[PDB]
C-alpha cells in the first residue's frame, strides 16, 4: 500500500492523477510537507530534488525530471540546440534562432537576407531587424527566432495552427507519445501583410479568448486533421507529419537523457511534456517550444491522466494509449 | 618530512581511526607491537612514513594519535585490544560519562572539564615532531562528544596552531545507523562552529556506506566494523601522499591548494571504486577505465548526490594497483564525452592523477576483497550541498516547535546559538548555489 | 553507570520485589545472590542494578520503603527477599491510611531522612551514578504521597542525576479507596516537576487486559503485577545489555523528551501472556510489530488512534532478522502515518537483544510518548473534579494539615498538562 | 588534453590532465563564553535549588 504528496495544486493534470489515485483505494494522500511519500506530485520551481531517496525502506518517486528546465525554457532550447552535436546548429527541424541579451551580433545573419533580398523574425513580429528595440525595452532574456512566414493554412478559413502533442518520459526513460494530439487553431484569415495585430498570427488559446467558427474550442482533434489532409492534400497525418514529430521529440530527449536519467539514482523521476510543433506549406515539421508542465485538452484529461497512472505510477508500485519512440 | 598528528573523537572517531591505523600498520609493515623490520634506521628518520609514525629507541613505531572520549567505554577496547601495545597510555584519553548525545553537554558542560588535558597530551606529540604541518580530526556530527568537544578542540587548535593546516574526517548523520534523534541539531551546531577552524573536510555520510555495504559487500545488516573497514580503506587511500613517495597532495597544505579554491567550500565529495566482496567466488577484475567510470556513479559516493546538477571546482584521482597514465588519459577522454561534467568558469576542467603501484591492503578476513586497481576520486562538487540541503530541513522542522531544546539550554547554551549556527547553514547553501548555479 | 532502585509503599514494594525476581533470573542471579549462568552478556552491565560485594555475590541495589511493615516482611519472606541488603529496609509503624498529606507531610516526613540516609550510602558506593528508578503506585498514601516527597528530596541532593519513575495509575475497576483520584492528581503535580520519565502504568489497562484479551473473569494482583514485570523488564532491556545503542537513563530522556513536562510515556508489550500459559508457538516479526503496537498490548488505558506519536523506543528480544523487525517498524508507520508527528523526524527507534525474557522465544516491549496519554489524565482529572467540586472526604486531608487551595493547584496543573498535550496533537 | 607536470618514483607517478582553460577568536574570547554558559547554568540551578526551598 502507497503514498503520495502534493505540492502543485494549480497542477490541472496532477489534480485528476490525486483524483485517479485516491479513487483506487491503494493510494493514501498526506500532509504535502510529510517526507515518508512513496510519490511526490512537485512544484513547479524549486522542488527539493536534493531530500528525495534518503527514506529508508521508501521507494520514492516525483512527477519531475530534474534538468529538464534546459529544454522547456526558450533561452536554454536555443542553446542546448546550437552547443548539441546530437543536435547541431545544422539542425533541420528547428528554426534559425538566437539568444538577445538585454550574441546580437547575428544580424550578419539578417543582415545577409537583406543582401540576399524574406527576414520577418519574432522575439513581437516585424521585419525592419528592429523591435531588438523591444528587447532592450523589456529586460528580460528573450530569443529571436525566424518566423516561419509560409505555413500550412486550414481550408476553409485560410488559418493557422500549431500542434500539441503529449509525451510521457518514465523512470526508465521510456519515451510515450500519446496516440492523441491537438490543433490550436486561429479562427483568423492569415494575414501576410498586417503582422501587427497578431490573432492570426499567434495560435494560443488565450490570444483568441471569431473565436470558435469552424472547430469547438478552436482546437481540432487527429481524427479531424487525418481525414482533411486525405480530402485536401492526398496524404495521412502519419506519413506526412507524425514521422517528423516522432523524430523530433526522440531526438530531444535522447540528447538530455545523460543529463536528466535517474537510471541508477537513489530516487526516480518520470515527467509529462508538451511540445509544440508547426507545420509549413511542404508539410515540412518545426519544433516550436517544450512544455515542462503542460496543461490538457479538456476532452483528453481523462484518458492521458489515466494513462500516466498506468505506466508512470503503477509501473513503480505495483497495484495501450501511448505509441513507445524506440531507441 | 613533516609530522601530521591524528586526533579521534568520540565513539565514531575512536573506532574509525583504530580501523585506519590497523590499515596503516598492514599497509607500512608494522606489526602489532609496533616493530617494523624493514625499517633499517632504529629509532629515527625522516622517511614518509614518519609523517605517522614516530620511533622509539627500541624500534617501536608508534602512531603520531590521540584518541579522546568522555566516556571509557570504547578506548578502553583499544587499551586491551590487538594493537594495545602500539599506543602509549598518554594518547589515550577518557572521562567518566558522556555528552548523552548532545552538542551543549560536549562542548561546555563536559568539555570544559578535559579541554586543557586533552590539549596538554596533543603538546606532548607535537613537540616531539621537527616540523609539524598539522592535525587530522576524526569525529562523527551526531553525538555529542564528536560534535560538541571536537568544535571545541578546533577552537583552541587554531588558538595554539595558528599556522598549522587542520582537516576532518566527518561522519554525517543517517537513520539506518542513528543513535539520537536530535543529530540534526547536533549536525548544525558543530558545522557552524568548525567551519573557520577547519581547512577541509571530507564528509563520509553513513547512507552511502551503508548501503555500498548493502549493495556491493551482501552484507544484509552492516555493523560499524563493516562500515569502518570500508572508510579507512578510503581515508588511506586519502592519507597515502603523505606515507608514501610521491609528488601529489605531499603536505596538509597542497590538499587546501588543490581542492579547496574558496574557503567555506572545503567538503571535497570522494568516491570509491571497485568496492568487492570476498565471499564472491567469481570475479572479473575491472580494467583502469571501469573502476574511473564509476568515480561518477552516485552509488559510489560518499555522500548521495548529483553531481551532473553542480559544478566542479576540483578534481583529484587517486589510483592504487596496476594503473599506467596512458589508461587514465584514455578512460578520462571517453568519460568526458560520455558524462556531465561541468567545471565552473574560472577553473580549468582538469584532473590531478596520482598513482601508487601497491595495489589496495584489505585487512585480513575482512569483507573486501583484492582488487588488481582501485581508485578515490576527490572533486569539490556544489551537489555535495544536497547534504546540507538535507541535514537543514530536519533542523527546521523540530526547530519550528523548539523540539528538544530545552535540553540544550539546560547546559547553559542560548537559544540564540541554534538561529546563529542556522544562519550559517543558510549562508552555505547560498555560497553553493551562487558558485554552482 | 549505576542505577539506584527505590520501592515505597504496597505496591511499589509488590511490583518492586517481581521486577528484582524477574531481571535476577534473566541475569543468571540465584536467590542467594550467586550467579549461575550460560552467557556473559548477563554480566557485562550487570553492575547497573546489582552491587558486587566479596565473595562474587550481586547484590540488588535496591532500597525498600514503607510506612507499614507488613509488606517489607513480605518481601524479604519472598522467593528473592534474602537477596536484599539488610540495611536498605526503612520502614515505619504507622502507615499512611491511603491518605497523600499523611505520606507528603506528616507521617512521611517523619521517615524520609532515613531513606535519605540509604540512598546517599548506594550513592557514595557508585563509579558513575546514572540517577534513580522509583516504583510505586499514585492512589495510596506512602507510595504517592511519600514517594513524591523522595522525590523531591532527592532531586534536592542529586540535581544533575536523572529520575525516573514506574507509577500505577488508580482505576476504580482495581479501586482500593474513593480518594484515589485525590492521592493521584496530588502526586501527578510532583511528577510534571520532578521526574524525568515516568511509565504510566495503569490499573485500568491492566485490568482490561487481563479480563478482554487473556480471558481472566476475576483479575488479582498477581495478574495484574505479572503484565507489569514483563513491562519492566523489556523497558530496562537496553539498560540492562550491552547494545549498539549502549542506552542509559539520560540518552532515553534526550531522545524520547522533546518538551520537559511531556514525559508520561505509555508503554506496550508482544506478547501478551498470563501466568504460567503455554506459549508453544512463538510469535512472527510481523505479529509481534503489530500486536505490540495495538490498542489492546498498551500498559496505559489510552487509545493511540486519538493522539500521535512524538516519540517511540522499541526492543525486539530473541533471535531474529534485525532486518525484517525493520521493515515491519518501517511499514508500520507507513500505515499509520496520522498517528506519528511529521516533524520530528527519526522519532521511531528500534533496538534488538539477543536474550528473550523467560518463556518466550521472541518479544517487542514498546515505550511511547504519545499525546493520547492526556485520556489517562483527563480520566483522572474528572474522578477529582466529582468529589472536590462538593469537597467531599476532603477532611482527612485538611485534618493533616492541608488547604483546599493545594488542591485547586493540583488540579490545576494537571489539566494544564492536558492542553499542553493537545497542542502537539493539534500541530 | 594536456598531460602535465608527470613525475616518476618506484613507489608510482602522479601528473595533471588539462581538457580545456579556465573562461578567529582569542583565548579569552573562549574562555569568555565556556564561563558564560556556565553562570547560565550555576543561575539554573540555584534557581531551581531556591524553588526547592520554598
Ligand atoms: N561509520 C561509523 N559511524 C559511527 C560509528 N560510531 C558511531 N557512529 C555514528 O555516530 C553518530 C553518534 O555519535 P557517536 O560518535 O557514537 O557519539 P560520541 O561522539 O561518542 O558522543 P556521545 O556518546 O554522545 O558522548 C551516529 O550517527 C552513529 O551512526 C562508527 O564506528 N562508524
Ligand atoms: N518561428 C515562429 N514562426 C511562426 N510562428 C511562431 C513562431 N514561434 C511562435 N509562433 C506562433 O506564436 C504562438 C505562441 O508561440 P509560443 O510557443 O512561443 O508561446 P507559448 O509559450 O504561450 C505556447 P504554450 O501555451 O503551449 O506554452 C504559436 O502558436 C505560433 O503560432
Ligand atoms: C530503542 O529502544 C530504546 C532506546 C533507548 C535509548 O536510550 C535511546 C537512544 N536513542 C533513542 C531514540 C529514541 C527515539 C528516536 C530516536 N532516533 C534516534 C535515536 C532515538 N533511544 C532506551 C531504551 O530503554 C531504556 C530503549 O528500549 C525501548
Ligand atoms: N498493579 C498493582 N497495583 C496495586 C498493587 N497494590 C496496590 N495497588 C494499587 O495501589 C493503590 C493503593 O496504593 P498502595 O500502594 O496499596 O498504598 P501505599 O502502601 O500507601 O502506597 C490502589 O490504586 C491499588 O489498586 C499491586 O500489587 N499491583
Ligand atoms: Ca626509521
Ligand atoms: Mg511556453
Ligand atoms: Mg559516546
Ligand atoms: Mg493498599
Given at each position: 500500500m502507497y503514498t503520495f504528496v502534493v505540492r502543485d495544486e494549480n497542477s490541472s493534470v496532477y489534480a485528476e492523477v490525486s483524483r485517479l489515485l485516491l479513487a483506487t483505494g491503494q493510494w493514501k494522500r498526506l500532509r504535502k510537507d510529510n517526507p515518508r511519500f512513496n510519490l511526490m506530485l512537485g512544484e513547479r520551481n524549486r522542488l527539493p530534488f536534493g531530500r528525495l531517496g534518503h527514506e529508508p525502506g521508501l521507494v520514492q518517486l516525483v512527477n519531475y525530471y530534474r534538468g529538464a528546465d534546459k529544454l522547456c525554457r526558450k533561452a536554454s532550447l536555443v542553446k542546448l540546440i546550437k552547443t548539441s552535436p546530437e543536435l547541431s546548429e545544422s539542425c533541420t527541424w528547428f528554426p534559425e534562432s538566437y539568444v538577445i541579451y538585454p550574441r546580437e551580433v547575428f544580424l550578419a545573419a539578417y543582415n545577409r537576407r537583406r543582401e540576399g533580398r524574406g527576414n520577418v523574425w519574432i522575439a513581437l513580429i516585424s521585419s525592419e531587424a528592429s523591435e531588438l528595440d523591444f528587447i532592450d525595452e523589456q529586460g528580460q532574456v528573450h530569443v529571436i527566432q525566424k518566423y516561419l512566414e509560409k505555413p500550412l493554412l486550414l481550408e476553409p478559413?485560410?488559418?493557422?495552427?500549431?500542434?500539441?502533442?503529449?509525451?510521457?518520459?518514465?523512470?526508465?526513460?521510456?519515451?510515450?507519445?500519446?496516440?492523441?494530439?491537438?490543433?490550436?487553431?486561429?479562427?483568423?484569415?492569415?494575414?501576410?501583410?498586417?503582422?501587427?495585430?497578431?490573432?492570426?498570427?499567434?495560435?494560443?488559446?488565450?490570444?483568441?479568448?471569431?473565436?470558435?467558427?469552424?472547430?469547438?474550442?478552436?482546437?481540432?482533434?487527429?481524427?479531424?486533421?487525418?481525414?482533411?489532409?486525405?480530402?485536401?492534400?492526398?496524404?495521412?497525418?502519419?506519413?506526412?507529419?507524425?514521422?517528423?514529430?516522432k523524430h523530433i521529440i526522440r531526438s530531444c530527449l535522447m540528447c538530455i537523457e545523460p543529463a536528466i536519467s535517474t537510471k541508477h539514482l537513489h530516487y526516480q523521476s518520470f515527467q509529462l511534456f508538451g511540445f509544440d510543433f508547426m507545420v509549413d506549406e511542404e508539410l515540412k515539421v518545426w519544433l516550436i517550444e517544450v512544455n515542462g508542465a503542460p496543461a490538457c485538452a479538456q476532452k483528453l484529461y481523462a484518458e492521458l491522466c489515466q494513462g500516466i497512472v498506468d505506466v508512470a505510477i503503477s509501473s513503480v508500485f505495483p497495484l495501450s494509449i501511448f505509441i513507445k519512440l524506440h531507441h | 618530512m613533516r609530522e601530521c598528528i591524528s586526533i579521534h573523537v568520540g565513539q565514531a572517531g575512536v573506532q574509525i581511526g583504530n580501523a585506519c591505523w590497523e590499515l596503516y600498520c598492514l599497509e607500512h609493515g608494522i606489526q602489532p607491537d609496533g616493530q617494523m623490520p624493514s625499517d633499517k634506521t632504529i629509532g629515527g628518520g625522516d622517511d614518509s612514513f614518519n609523517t605517522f609514525f614516530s620511533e622509539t629507541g627500541a624500534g617501536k613505531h608508534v602512531p603520531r594519535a590521540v584518541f579522546v572520549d568522555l566516556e571509557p567505554t570504547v578506548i578502553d577496547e583499544v587499551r586491551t585490544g590487538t594493537y594495545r601495545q602500539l599506543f602509549h597510555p598518554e594518547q589515550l584519553i577518557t572521562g567518566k560519562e558522556d555528552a548523552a548525545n548532545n552538542y551543549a553537554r560536549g562542548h561546555y558542560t563536559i568539555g570544559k572539564e578535559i579541554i586543557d588535558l586533552v590539549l596538554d597530551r596533543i603538546r606532548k606529540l607535537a613537540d616531539q615532531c621537527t616540523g609539524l604541518q598539522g592535525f587530522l580530526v576524526?569525529?562523527?556530527?551526531?553525538?555529542?562528544?564528536?560534535?560538541?568537544?571536537?568544535?571545541?578542540?578546533?577552537?583552541?587548535?587554531?588558538?595554539?596552531?595558528?599556522?598549522?593546516?587542520?582537516?576532518?574526517?566527518?561522519?554525517?548523520?543517517?537513520?539506518?545507523?542513528?543513535?539520537?534523534?536530535?543529530?540534526?541539531?547536533?549536525?548544525?551546531?558543530?558545522?557552524?562552529?568548525?567551519?573557520?577552524?577547519?581547512?577541509?573536510?571530507?564528509?563520509?555520510?553513513?547512507?552511502?556506506?551503508?548501503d555500498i555495504c548493502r549493495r556491493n559487500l551482501d552484507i544484509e545488516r552492516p555493523t560499524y566494523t563493516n562500515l569502518n573497514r570500508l572508510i579507512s580503506q578510503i581515508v588511506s587511500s586519502i592519507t597515502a601522499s603523505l606515507r608514501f613517495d610521491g609528488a601529489l597532495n605531499?603536505?596538509?597544505?597542497?590538499?587546501?591548494?588543490?581542492?579547496?579554491?574558496?574557503?567555506?567550500?572545503?567538503?571535497?565529495?570522494?568516491?570509491?571504486?571497485?568496492?568487492?566482496?570476498?565471499?564472491?567466488?567469481?570475479?572479473?577484475?575491472?580494467?583502469?577505465?571501469?573502476?574511473?567510470?564509476?568515480?561518477?556513479?552516485?552509488?559510489?559516493?560518499?555522500?548521495?548526490?548529483?553531481?551532473?546538477?553542480?559544478?566542479?571546482?576540483?578534481?583529484?584521482?587517486?589510483?592504487?594497483?596496476?594503473?599506467?597514465?596512458?589508461?587514465?588519459?584514455?578512460?578520462?577522454?571517453?568519460?568526458?564525452?560520455?558524462?556531465?561534467?561541468?567545471?565552473?568558469?574560472?577553473?580549468?576542467?582538469?584532473?590531478?592523477?596520482?598513482?601508487?603501484?601497491?595495489?589496495?591492503?584489505?585487512?585480513?578476513?575482512?569483507?573486501?576483497?583484492?582488487?588488481?586497481?582501485?581508485?578515490?576520486?576527490?572533486?569539490?562538487?556544489?551537489?555535495?550541498?544536497?547534504?546540507?540541503?538535507?541535514?537543514?530541513?530536519?533542523?527546521?522542522?523540530?526547530?519550528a516547535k523548539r523540539a528538544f531544546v530545552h535540553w540544550y539550554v539546560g547546559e547553559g547554551m542560548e537559544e540564540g546559538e541554534f538561529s546563529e549556527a542556522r544562519e550559517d547553514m543558510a549562508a552555505l547553501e547560498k555560497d553553493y548555489e551562487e558558485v554552482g548555479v | 553507570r549505576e542505577i539506584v532502585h527505590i520501592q515505597a509503599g504496597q505496591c511499589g514494594n509488590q511490583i518492586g520485589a517481581k521486577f528484582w525476581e524477574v531481571i535476577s533470573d534473566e541475569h543468571g542471579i540465584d536467590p542467594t545472590g550467586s550467579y549461575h549462568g550460560d552467557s556473559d552478556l548477563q554480566l557485562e552491565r550487570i553492575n547497573v542494578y546489582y552491587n558486587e560485594a566479596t565473595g562474587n555475590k550481586y547484590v540488588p541495589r535496591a532500597i525498600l520503603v514503607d510506612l507499614e511493615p507488613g509488606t517489607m516482611d513480605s518481601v524479604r519472606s519472598g522467593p528473592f527477599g534474602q537477596i536484599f541488603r539488610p540495611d536498605n529496609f526503612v520502614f515505619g509503624q504507622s502507615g499512611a491510611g491511603n491518605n497523600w498529606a499523611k505520606g507528603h507531610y506528616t507521617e512521611g516526613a517523619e521517615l524520609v531522612d532515613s531513606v535519605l540516609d540509604v540512598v546517599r550510602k548506594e550513592s557514595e558506593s557508585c563509579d558513575c551514578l546514572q540517577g534513580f528508578q522509583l516504583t510505586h503506585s499514585l492512589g495510596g498514601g506512602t507510595g504517592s504521597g511519600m514517594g513524591t516527597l523522595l522525590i523531591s528530596k532527592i532531586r534536592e541532593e542529586y540535581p544533575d542525576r536523572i529520575m525516573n519513575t514506574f507509577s500505577v495509575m488508580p482505576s476504580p475497576k482495581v479501586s482500593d479507596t474513593v480518594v484515589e483520584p485525590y492521592n493521584?492528581?496530588?502526586?501527578?503535580?510532583?511528577?510534571?516537576?520532578?521526574?524525568?520519565?515516568?511509565?504510566?502504568?495503569?490499573?485500568?489497562?491492566?485490568?482490561?487486559?487481563?479480563?478482554?484479551?487473556?480471558?481472566?473473569?476475576?483479575?488479582?494482583?498477581?495478574?495484574?503485577?505479572?503484565?507489569?514485570?514483563?513491562?519492566?523488564?523489556?523497558?530496562?532491556?537496553?539498560?540492562?545489555?550491552?547494545?549498539?545503542?549502549?542506552?542509559?537513563?539520560?540518552?532515553?530522556?534526550?531522545?524520547?523528551?522533546?518538551?520537559?513536562?511531556?514525559?508520561?510515556?505509555?508503554?506496550?508489550?508482544?506478547?501478551?501472556?498470563?501466568?504460567?500459559?503455554?506459549?508453544?508457538?512463538?510469535?512472527?516479526?510481523?505479529?509481534?510489530?503489530?500486536?505490540?503496537?495495538?490498542?489492546?498490548?498498551?500498559?496505559?488505558?489510552?487509545?493511540?488512534?486519538?493522539?500521535?506519536?512524538?516519540?517511540?523506543?522499541?526492543?525486539?528480544?530473541?533471535?531474529?532478522?534485525?532486518?525484517?523487525?525493520?521493515?515491519?517498524?518501517?511499514?508500520?508507520?507507513?500505515?499509520?502515518?496520522?498517528?506519528?508527528?511529521?516533524?520530528?523526524?527519526?522519532?521511531?527507534?528500534?533496538?534488538?537483544?539477543?536474550?528473550?525474557?523467560?518463556?518466550?522465544?521472541?518479544?517487542?516491549?514498546?515505550?511511547?510518548?504519545?499525546?493520547?496519554?492526556?485520556?489517562?489524565?483527563?480520566?483522572?482529572?474528572?474522578?477529582?473534579?466529582?468529589?472536590?467540586?462538593?469537597?467531599?472526604?476532603?477532611?482527612?486531608?485538611?485534618?493533616?494539615?492541608?488547604?483546599?487551595?493545594?488542591?485547586?493547584?493540583?488540579?490545576?496543573?494537571?489539566?494544564?498538562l492536558v492542553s499542553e498535550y493537545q497542542q502537539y496533537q493539534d500541530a | 588534453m594536456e598531460v602535465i607536470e608527470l613525475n616518476k618514483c618506484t613507489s608510482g607517478q602522479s601528473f595533471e590532465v588539462i581538457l580545456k582553460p579556465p573562461s578567529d577568536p582569542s583565548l579569552e574570547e573562549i574562555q569568555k563564553k565556556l564561563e558564560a554558559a556556565e553562570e547560565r547554568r550555576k543561575y539554573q540551578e540555584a534557581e531551581l535549588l531556591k524553588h526547592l526551598a520554598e
Amino acid at each position: 500500500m502507497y503514498t503520495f504528496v502534493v505540492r502543485d495544486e494549480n497542477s490541472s493534470v496532477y489534480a485528476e492523477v490525486s483524483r485517479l489515485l485516491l479513487a483506487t483505494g491503494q493510494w493514501k494522500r498526506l500532509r504535502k510537507d510529510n517526507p515518508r511519500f512513496n510519490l511526490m506530485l512537485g512544484e513547479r520551481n524549486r522542488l527539493p530534488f536534493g531530500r528525495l531517496g534518503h527514506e529508508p525502506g521508501l521507494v520514492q518517486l516525483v512527477n519531475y525530471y530534474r534538468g529538464a528546465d534546459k529544454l522547456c525554457r526558450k533561452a536554454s532550447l536555443v542553446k542546448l540546440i546550437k552547443t548539441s552535436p546530437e543536435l547541431s546548429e545544422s539542425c533541420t527541424w528547428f528554426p534559425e534562432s538566437y539568444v538577445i541579451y538585454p550574441r546580437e551580433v547575428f544580424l550578419a545573419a539578417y543582415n545577409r537576407r537583406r543582401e540576399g533580398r524574406g527576414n520577418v523574425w519574432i522575439a513581437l513580429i516585424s521585419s525592419e531587424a528592429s523591435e531588438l528595440d523591444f528587447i532592450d525595452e523589456q529586460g528580460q532574456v528573450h530569443v529571436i527566432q525566424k518566423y516561419l512566414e509560409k505555413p500550412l493554412l486550414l481550408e476553409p478559413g485560410h488559418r493557422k495552427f500549431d500542434i500539441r502533442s503529449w509525451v510521457l518520459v518514465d523512470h526508465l526513460y521510456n519515451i510515450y507519445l500519446y496516440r492523441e494530439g491537438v490543433l490550436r487553431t486561429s479562427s483568423e484569415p492569415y494575414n501576410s501583410a498586417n503582422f501587427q495585430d497578431k490573432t492570426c498570427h499567434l495560435t494560443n488559446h488565450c490570444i483568441q479568448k471569431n473565436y470558435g467558427r469552424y472547430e469547438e474550442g478552436n482546437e481540432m482533434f487527429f481524427e479531424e486533421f487525418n481525414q482533411y489532409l486525405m480530402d485536401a492534400l492526398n496524404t495521412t497525418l502519419e506519413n506526412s507529419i507524425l514521422l517528423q514529430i516522432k523524430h523530433i521529440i526522440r531526438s530531444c530527449l535522447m540528447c538530455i537523457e545523460p543529463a536528466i536519467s535517474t537510471k541508477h539514482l537513489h530516487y526516480q523521476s518520470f515527467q509529462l511534456f508538451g511540445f509544440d510543433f508547426m507545420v509549413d506549406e511542404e508539410l515540412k515539421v518545426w519544433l516550436i517550444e517544450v512544455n515542462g508542465a503542460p496543461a490538457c485538452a479538456q476532452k483528453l484529461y481523462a484518458e492521458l491522466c489515466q494513462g500516466i497512472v498506468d505506466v508512470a505510477i503503477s509501473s513503480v508500485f505495483p497495484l495501450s494509449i501511448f505509441i513507445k519512440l524506440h531507441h | 618530512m613533516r609530522e601530521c598528528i591524528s586526533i579521534h573523537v568520540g565513539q565514531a572517531g575512536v573506532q574509525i581511526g583504530n580501523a585506519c591505523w590497523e590499515l596503516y600498520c598492514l599497509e607500512h609493515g608494522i606489526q602489532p607491537d609496533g616493530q617494523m623490520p624493514s625499517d633499517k634506521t632504529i629509532g629515527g628518520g625522516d622517511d614518509s612514513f614518519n609523517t605517522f609514525f614516530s620511533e622509539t629507541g627500541a624500534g617501536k613505531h608508534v602512531p603520531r594519535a590521540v584518541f579522546v572520549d568522555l566516556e571509557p567505554t570504547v578506548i578502553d577496547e583499544v587499551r586491551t585490544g590487538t594493537y594495545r601495545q602500539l599506543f602509549h597510555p598518554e594518547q589515550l584519553i577518557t572521562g567518566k560519562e558522556d555528552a548523552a548525545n548532545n552538542y551543549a553537554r560536549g562542548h561546555y558542560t563536559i568539555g570544559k572539564e578535559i579541554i586543557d588535558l586533552v590539549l596538554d597530551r596533543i603538546r606532548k606529540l607535537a613537540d616531539q615532531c621537527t616540523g609539524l604541518q598539522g592535525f587530522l580530526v576524526f569525529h562523527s556530527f551526531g553525538g555529542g562528544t564528536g560534535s560538541g568537544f571536537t568544535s571545541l578542540l578546533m577552537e583552541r587548535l587554531s588558538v595554539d596552531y595558528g599556522k598549522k593546516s587542520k582537516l576532518e574526517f566527518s561522519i554525517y548523520p543517517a537513520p539506518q545507523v542513528s543513535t539520537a534523534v536530535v543529530e540534526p541539531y547536533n549536525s548544525i551546531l558543530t558545522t557552524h562552529t568548525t567551519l573557520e577552524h577547519s581547512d577541509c573536510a571530507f564528509m563520509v555520510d553513513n547512507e552511502a556506506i551503508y548501503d555500498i555495504c548493502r549493495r556491493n559487500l551482501d552484507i544484509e545488516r552492516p555493523t560499524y566494523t563493516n562500515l569502518n573497514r570500508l572508510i579507512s580503506q578510503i581515508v588511506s587511500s586519502i592519507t597515502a601522499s603523505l606515507r608514501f613517495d610521491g609528488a601529489l597532495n605531499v603536505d596538509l597544505t597542497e590538499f587546501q591548494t588543490n581542492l579547496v579554491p574558496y574557503p567555506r567550500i572545503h567538503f571535497p565529495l570522494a568516491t570509491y571504486a571497485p568496492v568487492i566482496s570476498a565471499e564472491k567466488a567469481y570475479h572479473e577484475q575491472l580494467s583502469v577505465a571501469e573502476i574511473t567510470n564509476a568515480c561518477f556513479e552516485p552509488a559510489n559516493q560518499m555522500v548521495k548526490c548529483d553531481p551532473r546538477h553542480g559544478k566542479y571546482m576540483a578534481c583529484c584521482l587517486l589510483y592504487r594497483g596496476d594503473v599506467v597514465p596512458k589508461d587514465v588519459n584514455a578512460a578520462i577522454a571517453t568519460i568526458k564525452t560520455k558524462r556531465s561534467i561541468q567545471f565552473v568558469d574560472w577553473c580549468p576542467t582538469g584532473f590531478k592523477v596520482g598513482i601508487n603501484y601497491q595495489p589496495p591492503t584489505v585487512v585480513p578476513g575482512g569483507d573486501l576483497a583484492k582488487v588488481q586497481r582501485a581508485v578515490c576520486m576527490l572533486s569539490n562538487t556544489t551537489a555535495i550541498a544536497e547534504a546540507w540541503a538535507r541535514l537543514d530541513h530536519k533542523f527546521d522542522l523540530m526547530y519550528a516547535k523548539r523540539a528538544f531544546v530545552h535540553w540544550y539550554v539546560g547546559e547553559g547554551m542560548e537559544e540564540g546559538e541554534f538561529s546563529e549556527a542556522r544562519e550559517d547553514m543558510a549562508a552555505l547553501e547560498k555560497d553553493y548555489e551562487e558558485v554552482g548555479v | 553507570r549505576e542505577i539506584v532502585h527505590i520501592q515505597a509503599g504496597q505496591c511499589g514494594n509488590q511490583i518492586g520485589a517481581k521486577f528484582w525476581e524477574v531481571i535476577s533470573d534473566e541475569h543468571g542471579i540465584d536467590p542467594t545472590g550467586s550467579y549461575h549462568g550460560d552467557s556473559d552478556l548477563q554480566l557485562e552491565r550487570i553492575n547497573v542494578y546489582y552491587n558486587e560485594a566479596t565473595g562474587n555475590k550481586y547484590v540488588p541495589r535496591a532500597i525498600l520503603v514503607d510506612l507499614e511493615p507488613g509488606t517489607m516482611d513480605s518481601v524479604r519472606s519472598g522467593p528473592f527477599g534474602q537477596i536484599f541488603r539488610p540495611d536498605n529496609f526503612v520502614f515505619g509503624q504507622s502507615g499512611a491510611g491511603n491518605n497523600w498529606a499523611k505520606g507528603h507531610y506528616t507521617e512521611g516526613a517523619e521517615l524520609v531522612d532515613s531513606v535519605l540516609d540509604v540512598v546517599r550510602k548506594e550513592s557514595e558506593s557508585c563509579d558513575c551514578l546514572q540517577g534513580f528508578q522509583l516504583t510505586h503506585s499514585l492512589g495510596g498514601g506512602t507510595g504517592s504521597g511519600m514517594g513524591t516527597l523522595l522525590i523531591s528530596k532527592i532531586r534536592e541532593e542529586y540535581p544533575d542525576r536523572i529520575m525516573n519513575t514506574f507509577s500505577v495509575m488508580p482505576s476504580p475497576k482495581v479501586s482500593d479507596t474513593v480518594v484515589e483520584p485525590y492521592n493521584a492528581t496530588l502526586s501527578v503535580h510532583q511528577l510534571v516537576e520532578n521526574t524525568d520519565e515516568t511509565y504510566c502504568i495503569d490499573n485500568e489497562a491492566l485490568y482490561d487486559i487481563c479480563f478482554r484479551t487473556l480471558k481472566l473473569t476475576t483479575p488479582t494482583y498477581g495478574d495484574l503485577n505479572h503484565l507489569v514485570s514483563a513491562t519492566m523488564s523489556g523497558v530496562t532491556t537496553c539498560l540492562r545489555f550491552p547494545g549498539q545503542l549502549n542506552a542509559d537513563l539520560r540518552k532515553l530522556a534526550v531522545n524520547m523528551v522533546p518538551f520537559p513536562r511531556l514525559h508520561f510515556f505509555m508503554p506496550g508489550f508482544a506478547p501478551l501472556t498470563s501466568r504460567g500459559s503455554q506459549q508453544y508457538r512463538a510469535l512472527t516479526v510481523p505479529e509481534l510489530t503489530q500486536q505490540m503496537f495495538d490498542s489492546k498490548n498498551m500498559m496505559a488505558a489510552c487509545d493511540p488512534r486519538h493522539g500521535r506519536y512524538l516519540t517511540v523506543a522499541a526492543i525486539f528480544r530473541g533471535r531474529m532478522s534485525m532486518k525484517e523487525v525493520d521493515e515491519q517498524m518501517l511499514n508500520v508507520q507507513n500505515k499509520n502515518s496520522s498517528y506519528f508527528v511529521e516533524w520530528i523526524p527519526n522519532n521511531v527507534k528500534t533496538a534488538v537483544c539477543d536474550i528473550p525474557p523467560r518463556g518466550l522465544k521472541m518479544s517487542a516491549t514498546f515505550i511511547g510518548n504519545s499525546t493520547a496519554i492526556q485520556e489517562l489524565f483527563k480520566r483522572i482529572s474528572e474522578q477529582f473534579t466529582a468529589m472536590f467540586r462538593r469537597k467531599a472526604f476532603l477532611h482527612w486531608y485538611t485534618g493533616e494539615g492541608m488547604d483546599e487551595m493545594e488542591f485547586t493547584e493540583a488540579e490545576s496543573n494537571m489539566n494544564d498538562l492536558v492542553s499542553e498535550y493537545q497542542q502537539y496533537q493539534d500541530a | 588534453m594536456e598531460v602535465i607536470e608527470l613525475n616518476k618514483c618506484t613507489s608510482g607517478q602522479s601528473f595533471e590532465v588539462i581538457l580545456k582553460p579556465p573562461s578567529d577568536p582569542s583565548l579569552e574570547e573562549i574562555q569568555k563564553k565556556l564561563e558564560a554558559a556556565e553562570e547560565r547554568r550555576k543561575y539554573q540551578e540555584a534557581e531551581l535549588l531556591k524553588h526547592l526551598a520554598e
